[PDB]
Design a protein around this ligand. Structure first.
Ligand SMILES: O=C1NC(=O)[C@H](Cc2ccc3ccccc3c2)N1
Ligand code: NA
Length: 456
C-alpha cells in the first residue's frame, strides 16, 4: 500500500474551494514578475495590442486545457503524482513526473530570488545593508512555513492580495500614462519594430508559461467544491463553472500586468516597471519605492507557493509515503529548489526550459485520453494506492505509455511553432490505439472500483 493521510483522496467534507474562490486563487497567481519579462520582450516582435491578444488567447487555450485536466481532480480528490499512475506505470509515471517536479522546483527557486531581491531592496533602502543569499533562505523558509498551512493559507492570502494587487497595478498604469503624457490608445500600438516571430508562436509562449501549472493543476483543484450526487450534465457544468472561474481569474490579471511589462519595454526600454516608472517620473521617494518592492513581494507570494511548491511536496510524500508527509516534502522541495541556484541559469537556459515545457503536451494528451477516452471516467482509487493492481502493468511501468510519449514528442518537432499542440493532439490520438492493445494483456477496470466512495 502506497496510501498515507497526506496522499489520500480528499473527502467531500474536507473540500473548501468554490468557483469564486478559485478565481481569487488564479487572479493573484497570474500577477507576477515573469510576465513582465515575457510581455516586454514580446514588444520586439509585435505591438502592445497584439500582445494583449496573444495573452488573452494564450490564457484561453490554457483554460480550454484546464476544463479537461481538472475534471478528474475535482470529482475524485486525487493527487497529480498519484493520478499519473493510471496510463504510465505506478512507478513508470515517476519519469514524466520527475521532469515536471523539476520544472516546478526550478520556478520555485527563480521566484524566491525575485522575492528576495524585493526584500533585500526594501532593507537596503533603509540601512544600505545588501545581503541577498540570507534573504533568499529566509524567504524560502517563510514560504514553506506559510505553505505548511497548505491550501488553507493560499486561499486566504489570495483573496486579500487580489484587490490590493489589482489596485497597486491599475495605479501603476495611471502613473506611467500620466507622467509620460500619453493616452492608453497611443501606448496600445507602440511596439513591433522587429517582426519575425509568428503570432502562433506568440500565443504558444503564454500557454507554455502555465504549462507546468495546468498539466498538474490537480494539486490545487482536488480541493474544489463538488456535489457527489450530480449527473453527467451537472458534472459538466460544474467543470465548466470552474474552468470559467479560472478564466475569469487568470485573464483580467495577466492582461493588466502583461500590459505593464510591455508598456515598460515600450516607454523606457526595460520590462522592469521599477526602472521604467522611476525614469518617466524622474525618481521617487523612499516610501513609494519600498511599496513597489512590497508589491513584488506580495506579487511573488501569491504565485510561487501555490504554483511551484505544492506539487513537488505531493510528489515526495506520495511516492515515498512512509518516508515523507506533505509538510516534510514541502521542506525537502524548497531545499532542493534553492540548492539548484536557478537565478544564475535562467538567462542561459531560457530556450532550454521552453523545450522541456512544451514537451509536457503528450503528458497532458495522454492524461486527458486515459481518463476521458480510454477508461470513460471510470477509475479505481483502490488500485492507485497499491503497488500491484490494474495500474501496475509490466512490473510497475507501462512501457507502451512511455512509447506514445516519445513518438508524440517526435511528431511534435515537425511543427516547431505549434510543438505543444501537435504533440498533445498526437499523444491524445495515439494513446487510443496503444491502450486498446495493452487492454488485451492487462485489465482497464477493476472490481475494487466500487470502494471508490469509501475514499470520499
Ligand atoms: O508554472 C509556473 N510556475 C512559475 O513560477 C511560472 C510562472 C510564469 C513564468 C513565465 C511566464 C511567461 C509567460 C506567461 C506566463 C508565465 C508564467 N510558471
Ligand atoms: Na502572485
Amino acid at each position: 500500500s502506497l496510501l498515507n493521510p497526506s496522499n489520500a483522496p480528499t473527502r467531500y467534507a474536507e473540500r473548501s474551494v468554490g468557483p469564486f474562490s478559485l478565481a481569487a486563487i488564479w487572479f493573484a497567481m497570474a500577477i507576477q514578475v515573469a510576465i513582465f519579462i515575457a510581455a516586454g520582450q514580446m514588444t520586439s516582435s509585435f505591438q502592445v495590442w497584439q500582445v494583449i491578444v496573444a495573452i488573452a488567447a494564450g490564457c484561453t487555450i490554457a483554460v480550454i486545457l484546464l476544463f479537461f485536466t481538472q475534471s478528474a481532480a475535482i470529482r475524485w480528490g486525487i493527487n497529480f503524482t498519484v493520478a499519473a499512475r493510471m496510463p504510465f506505470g505506478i512507478r513508470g509515471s515517476l519519469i514524466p513526473i520527475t521532469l515536471k517536479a523539476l520544472l516546478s522546483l526550478f520556478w520555485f527557486g527563480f521566484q524566491t530570488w525575485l522575492g528576495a531581491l524585493a526584500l533585500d531592496e526594501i532593507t537596503r533602502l533603509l540601512t544600505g545593508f545588501t545581503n541577498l543569499p540570507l534573504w533568499i533562505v529566509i524567504f524560502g523558509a517563510i514560504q514553506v512555513v506559510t505553505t505548511f498551512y497548505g491550501i488553507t493559507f493560499i486561499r486566504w492570502m489570495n483573496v486579500f492580495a487580489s484587490p490590493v494587487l489589482l489596485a497597486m497595478g491599475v495605479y501603476m498604469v495611471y502613473l506611467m500614462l500620466d507622467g509620460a503624457d500619453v493616452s492608453l490608445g497611443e501606448v496600445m500600438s507602440m511596439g513591433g519594430e522587429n517582426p519575425g516571430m509568428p503570432f502562433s508562436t506568440a500565443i504558444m509562449i503564454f500557454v507554455g508559461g502555465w504549462i507546468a501549472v495546468v498539466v498538474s493543476i490537480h494539486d490545487i483543484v482536488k480541493e474544489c467544491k463538488v456535489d457527489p450526487n450530480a449527473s453527467r450534465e451537472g458534472q459538466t457544468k460544474a467543470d465548466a463553472r470552474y474552468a470559467t472561474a479560472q478564466w475569469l481569474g487568470m485573464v483580467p490579471a495577466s492582461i493588466i500586468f502583461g500590459f505593464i511589462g510591455a508598456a515598460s519595454m515600450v516607454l523606457v526600454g526595460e520590462w522592469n516597471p521599477v526602472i521604467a516608472i522611476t525614469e518617466v517620473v524622474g525618481g521617487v521617494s523612499i516610501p513609494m519605492a519600498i511599496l513597489f518592492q512590497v508589491f513584488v513581494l506580495l506579487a511573488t507570494w501569491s504565485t510561487n507557493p501555490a504554483a511551484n511548491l505544492l506539487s513537488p511536496a505531493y510528489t515526495l510524500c506520495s511516492t515515498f509515503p512512509r518516508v515523507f508527509t506533505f509538510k516534510t516534502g514541502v521542506i525537502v522541495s524548497a531545499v532542493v529548489g534553492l540548492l539548484m541556484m536557478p537565478w544564475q541559469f535562467a538567462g542561459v537556459l531560457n530556450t532550454f526550459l521552453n523545450l522541456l515545457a512544451s514537451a509536457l503536451g503528450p503528458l497532458a494528451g495522454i492524461m486527458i485520453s486515459d481518463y476521458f477516452l480510454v477508461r470513460r471516467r471510470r477509475i479505481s482509487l483502490h488500485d492507485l494506492y497499491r503497488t500491484k493492481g490494474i495500474y501496475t502493468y509490466w512490473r510497475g511501468v507501462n512501457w507502451v505509455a512511455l512509447a506514445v510519449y516519445a513518438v508524440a514528442l517526435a511528431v511534435s518537432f515537425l511543427t516547431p511553432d505549434l510543438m505543444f499542440v501537435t504533440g498533445l493532439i498526437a499523444a491524445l490520438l495515439l494513446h487510443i490505439p496503444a491502450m486498446r492493445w495493452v487492454a488485451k494483456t492487462f485489465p482497464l477496470f477493476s472490481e475494487a472500483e466500487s470502494r471508490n466512495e469509501d475514499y470520499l
